[PDB]
Amino acid sequence: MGVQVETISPGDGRTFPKRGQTCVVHYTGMLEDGKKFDSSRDRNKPFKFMLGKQEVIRGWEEGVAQMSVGQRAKLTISPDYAYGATGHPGIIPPHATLVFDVELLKLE
């Protein structure tokens, strides 16, 4: 599997991120059992990344591209679209399916 996108709150339904645009998001990352491992909200600062530059995992590149500006959505990302077999030891276990709560605040 790749990334499943499941809406939490609707965006404008019209403006979707394109290649080279900077996405401004708030996010929370959890393991499949629900343990949080990362969150921009706990730092109280939105996270920015440029679509297509592979600054984020593949599930983010292809999942956030499906979101409209203002939308909050749940991204469920299989390990191939994620940290894979290796994971990130001490943070992300091997072969880990990840669940992200992502809100697309604006595009820059």
From Swiss-Prot:
Q: Which GO terms describe its biological process?
A: 'de novo' protein folding; amyloid fibril formation; heart morphogenesis; heart trabecula formation; negative regulation of activin receptor signaling pathway; negative regulation of transforming growth factor beta receptor signaling pathway; positive regulation of canonical NF-kappaB signal transduction; protein folding
The keyword Acetylation belongs to this UniProt entry's keyword annotation? yes
In the bilayer, the protein is annotated as: Peripheral membrane protein
Q: Which GO terms describe its cellular component?
A: cytoplasm; cytoplasmic side of membrane; cytosol; membrane; ryanodine receptor complex; sarcoplasmic reticulum; sarcoplasmic reticulum membrane; terminal cisterna
- Name all PPIase FKBP-type domain ranges: 20-108
Where's it mainly located? cytoplasm
MF annotations from Gene Ontology:
activin receptor binding; calcium channel regulator activity; FK506 binding; I-SMAD binding; macrolide binding; peptidyl-prolyl cis-trans isomerase activity; signaling receptor inhibitor activity; transforming growth factor beta receptor binding
Top-level taxon of origin: Eukaryota
On assembly, the entry states: Interacts with TGFBR1; prevents TGFBR1 phosphorylation by TGFBR2 and stabilizes it in the inactive conformation. Interacts with ACVR1B and SMAD7. Identified in a complex composed of RYR1, PDE4D, PKA, FKBP1A and protein phosphatase 1 (PP1). Interacts directly with RYR2 and RYR3. Interacts with GLMN; rapamycin and FK506 abolish the interaction with GLMN in a dose dependent manner. Interacts directly with RYR1.
- In its UniProt entry, what is this protein called? Peptidyl-prolyl cis-trans isomerase FKBP1A
Which species? Homo sapiens
